[PDB]
């Protein structure tokens, strides 16, 4: 039995006639098949979109800009806050201000978390460009928020 | 190494901080199957063109709030009632419509409803907007008709 | 808890009310590759000015589906079923976008120079691709064809969609 | 149990009422379904992209053996097709996967430079491949040719490992 292309996994095999390797996903095994999936999926959503800011990661760069190391300049932190923000998703704000009793501060927070999520979705541009206007005191509450919220949301 | 629970909601963003799996030739298919899910989600929400927002409009869903609007209870403007209306024509595919009104018989007067719903469906893919316009236009009583029969599609596809 | 029906076909809309599973992690796979294949349709359908073009809107009507665009292309090349030349060309742009070129390029590659077949092959991939750049003129274009040819070319069309499909 | 039809299994079944296969996704086994999303990615990822290689030959070559090929001056590959092969190998690669290489780099590692170089090619490229494709043209045929051979050698190191 031929062994899936590596190379079709991640997409595309590149080598034509010359593989002899499976592109024919109805003898892969199903693993396969899902891996591909999720190269493709991310290939897909990409196309309709320095060395240590990379290895921090964007929650690195936020939490950095936070406590002011790294050389995270403000201007990096809001395009980072961007990416966060793009990464989370309205719904599951909104389940999570339903559990919160009526005027709990939670909700103020929660509702401002969701509106910048949407700005972004909109116009991550622009949303950018507000994030910068914030003082540097207020931006890095409301980053603290995202990151706790985004922490929250994926351990249950 | 487990997988990455960011990762399987999308893309982790914790840089080489983060000690979990984000390889995902390494992963055990369920979490395969689930990161899949949540990345459709998104693509989808990608490709996307205020009143129900609100705390209770999301718990009764758009379901709720219609038929709410249709016994006249939980405040549900009739405007509200519009846009909601709106979001449930996209979650139906005009394809599973059509394979219902093949199973009816010529003058059933269900055919003259499928077509509406149909015709309402893709007026709403075209341009939801004054999709919604034209839903707003109706006579309150037949608007309620209207939503009642689109419900009952949904609810009559989605058990079979 | 098991999976929310209407979850698997897309998104739930019953807010609190629905007491079934909206959470991905405790679904079984089944349920799960259901829901992948409902909302790839999705996508795709929502990535799709064709049912303004005339002879199109024709064949939503109740026949001109139960037949397909196969049913309605098969009918138009042997004069039955009422089908207008105008609504074969549709049909003709539809199949075409079901199909991809690369699985034509993989059939020519197993033909020996100089087989007729690999004209064929070649004139149907130009078609597919004058598809996906302009549908609606592809469709004047197919309609300009005189009726013999066009019949020829669908023909043709339809053998390698059910040649790919059949390995 | 009536199977899956193996033309909704590429994508939606043209055939109406005549076809006595299953198009119910629930009745489907779990393997037919994997498939079809398979190619439904391959379709959707087709539809949202932006003459000379889709030749005989220059299929059965690949974007690899075009590109090979045209730095062993073989196969009869003009600069031109080179460079659209580049470009499609560009698209193939994510700027991710060689960031993630340039992190194993200690620093001043000579290699740094070239994913630097390879990973602006690829954003250009993302940006717009028709101007990508003139840059990659402009250069001089030597050095384009490294470049070529670096990518190429990046695309082949990712995918094992
Ligand atoms: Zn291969
Ligand atoms: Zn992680
Ligand atoms: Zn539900
Ligand atoms: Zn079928």
Redesign the interface.
């Known amino acids: 039995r031929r062994n899936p292309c ?2 079709e996994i ?10 002899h390797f499976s592109h024919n ?2 003898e ?1 095994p ?2 396969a ?16 979109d320095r ?1 240590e800011e ?7 760069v936020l939490e950095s800009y936070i406590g002011s190391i790294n050389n995270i300049t403000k201007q990096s932190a809001c395009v980072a806050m961007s ?2 923000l793009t ?1 989370l ?1 309205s719904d599951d704000i ?1 389940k999570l ?2 559990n919160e009793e009526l005027n709990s501060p939670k909700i103020r927070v929660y509702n401002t978390v969701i509106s910048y999520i949407e700005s972004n ?1 909109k116009n991550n541009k622009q949303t950018i460009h507000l994030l910068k206007r914030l003082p540097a005191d207020v931006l890095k509450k409301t980053i603290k928020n995202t990151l706790d919220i ?1 922490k929250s949301i ?2 249950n």
């Not at 990379?54 to 690195?60: I, Q, S, T």
Request: charge should be positive; glycine fraction near 8%.
């Open positions: 590596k190379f991640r997409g595309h095999c590149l080598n034509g006639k010359r593989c996903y109805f892969w199903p693993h098949l899902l891996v591909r999936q999720n190269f493709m999926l991310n290939r897909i959503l990409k196309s309709m060395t990379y290895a921090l990661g964007v929650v690195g990416k966060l990464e998703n909104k201000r339903d979705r985004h994926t351990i």
